[PDB]
């Protein structure tokens, strides 16, 4: 087995980790365990710290800022007498190879923390990846008040990720009935998806059934896969952006039924102009898929992403009320979009 390592600009400090991606199982998260190699030759400040930081990065010309959401600090050197932690198997392997000079560090990620999400940049952006990202920074100083010198430190980007649940949810199904006043005639819309859990790049099948017992006519049927992003930092923000769509000219005449299966597949190639779109966290600048739906058990910081399919019937009423009163009929179907658990 191999492990990751990164050194400070002048080499005096070297971090070691076992993996970059840490899985959030909701009930627990994979711990961030590692070691920091320090030589006595370059050990003058005589205090080495390690910090885990969950930060929201945001932007005029490529300038960015990091607001901390969760920060945790561990004093690797010296080992204070009032804190003795047992080493992980990964850590004890690392000391066995490196020696005493390697000082361990172990962070526990609490639940209800945001996952690593990167907001899509435009072609005219040169700054670092904006969004929510985790980061492990090891440095040495005389005390925590001292200003850390960029060369006496090292930072490594890590990600907090989730994977598809083992048990699939119930089949997403939804109904709605629009009843008009001119006559006692209902316009019924029923829609359903093939399954509850979908993987990225996989097709979504929307079964649509319309029972039009009214005098009006359905001119167009609009299907769309829409990404819901809830961003809770200061106050509140949120938006819906359609990662897939189809505008069928299928018509439902009065006093007639209609039934058709629409198949949509959300992918990034046709969404590269939608700046701010939620994507799965980027290590540095790697191309990543549409952000996976984050699952929360029972107002949580960071970017919370979900997905819904909207089926809208465009109706032309006319008659008594003319075109003043809208007669459109829509329904929505929530679903999960994330990657399978790597075996």
């Amino acid at each position: 087995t191999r492990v990751f390592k990164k050194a400070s600009p002048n080499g005096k400090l070297t971090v070691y980790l076992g993996k970059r991606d840490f899985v959030d199982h909701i009930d627990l998260v994979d711990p961030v365990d590692g070691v920091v190699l320090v030589d006595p030759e370059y050990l003058k400040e005589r205090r080495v710290y390690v910090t885990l930081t969950c930060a929201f990065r945001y932007g005029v010309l490529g300038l960015t800022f990091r607001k901390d959401l969760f920060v945790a600090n561990v004093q690797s050197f010296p080992p204070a007498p009032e804190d003795k932690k047992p080493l992980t198997r990964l850590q004890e392997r690392l000391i066995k190879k490196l020696g005493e000079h390697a000082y361990p560090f172990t962070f526990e990620i609490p639940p209800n923390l945001p996952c690593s999400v990167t907001l899509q940049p435009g072609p005219e952006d040169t700054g670092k990846a904006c969004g929510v990202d985790y980061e492990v920074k090891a440095f040495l100083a005389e005390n925590l008040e001292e200003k850390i010198h960029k060369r006496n430190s090292v930072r490594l980007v890590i990600r907090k990720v989730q994977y598809a649940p083992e048990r699939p949810g119930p089949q997403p199904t939804a109904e709605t009935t629009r009843q008009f006043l001119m006559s006692d005639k209902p316009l019924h819309l029923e829609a359903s998806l093939d399954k509850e859990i979908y993987y990225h790049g996989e097709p979504i099948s929307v079964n649509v059934h319309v029972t039009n017992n009214t005098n009006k006519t359905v001119k167009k049927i609009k299907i769309s896969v829409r990404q819901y992003a809830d961003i809770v930092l200061f106050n509140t923000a949120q938006y819906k952006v359609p990662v897939a769509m189809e505008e069928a000219d299928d018509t439902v005449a009065p006093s007639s039924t209609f039934s058709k299966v629409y198949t949509l597949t959300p992918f990034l190639a046709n969404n590269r102009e939608k700046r701010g779109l939620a994507l799965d966290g980027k290590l540095k600048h790697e191309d990543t898929n549409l952000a996976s739906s984050t699952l929360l058990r029972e107002e949580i910081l960071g970017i919370i992403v979900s997905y819904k399919v909207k089926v809208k019937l465009v109706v032309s009423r006319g008659g008594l009320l003319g075109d003043l009163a809208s007669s459109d009929v829509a329904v929505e179907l929530p679903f999960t979009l994330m990657h399978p658990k790597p075996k």
Epitope: Y199, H200, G201, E202, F267, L268, A269, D287
Partner: antibody, heavy 119, light 109 residues
Framework: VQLVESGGGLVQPGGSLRLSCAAS????????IHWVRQAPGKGLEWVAS????????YYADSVKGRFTISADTSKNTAYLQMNSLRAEDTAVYYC?????????????WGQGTLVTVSS | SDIQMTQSPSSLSASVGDRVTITCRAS??????VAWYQQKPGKAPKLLIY???SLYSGVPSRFSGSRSGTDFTLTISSLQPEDFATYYC?????????FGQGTKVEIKR
């Protein structure tokens, strides 16, 4: 699941030939359609790749500026359009499958039609 | 100006039930991004191991993989009638991806 190749045949040097492979059991966006070039007793040589989910094309340096890789996402087919064929490009071209998220190697191949280039 | 693979075995020959090993040294470190393949004559290749040591599904238990820096290996616990084909070493960290020359694994008579 199956991959089917067609469009292989003899073409004079400097000519043009086109190849396509059917896809069954694989979604175009959930996979990437690689291509390979193994002449008899010469070994595998990757010629081109297409990523439908990220809309990227990749070409071998020798291939660059000559073959074009495309994909009709509806019919689930990938079309390698070969232009300005050299006599050296005579080989059995296979069409491979890869996991779009994330790369797992070439886990499935088609039988591969025979391509010949000579005067 | 591209990474090249160096399968050390050229024409391995062994009897049934033997433990055979095949090693390919990457020109420069390609990390654990290494795959092994099996190709019968007149047939298309099959995938055996991915990520250097992660056995693929639909492959026997006998197959397994390891890494020694630039040297990546392919080991079969017991050799079988089915397992008598030319094998290959691949790298997919840097594009273009490249393969090995091929090893002529054959029966002993």
């Amino acid at each position: 699941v199956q991959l089917v190749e067609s469009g292989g045949g003899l073409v004079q040097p400097g000519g043009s030939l086109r190849l396509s492979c059917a896809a069954s059991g694989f979604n175009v966006y959930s996979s990437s359609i690689h291509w390979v070039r193994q002449a008899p007793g010469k070994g595998l040589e990757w010629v081109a790749s297409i990523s439908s989910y990220y809309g990227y094309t990749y070409y071998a340096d020798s291939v660059k500026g000559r073959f074009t890789i495309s994909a009709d996402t509806s019919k689930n087919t990938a079309y390698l359009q070969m232009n300005s064929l050299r006599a050296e490009d005579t080989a059995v071209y296979y069409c491979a499958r890869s996991r779009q998220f994330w790369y797992s190697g070439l886990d499935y191949w088609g039988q591969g039609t025979l391509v010949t280039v000579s005067s | 100006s591209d990474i090249q693979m160096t399968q050390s075995p050229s024409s391995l020959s062994a009897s049934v039930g033997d433990r055979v090993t095949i090693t390919c040294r990457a020109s420069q470190s390609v990390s654990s991004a290494v795959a092994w393949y099996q190709q019968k004559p007149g047939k298309a290749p099959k995938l055996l191991i991915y990520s250097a040591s992660s056995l693929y599904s639909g492959v026997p238990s006998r197959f397994s993989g390891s890494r020694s820096g630039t040297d990546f290996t392919l080991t079969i616990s017991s050799l079988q009638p089915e397992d008598f084909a030319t094998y290959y070493c691949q790298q997919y960290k840097y594009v273009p991806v490249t393969f090995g020359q091929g090893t002529k694994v054959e029966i002993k008579r």
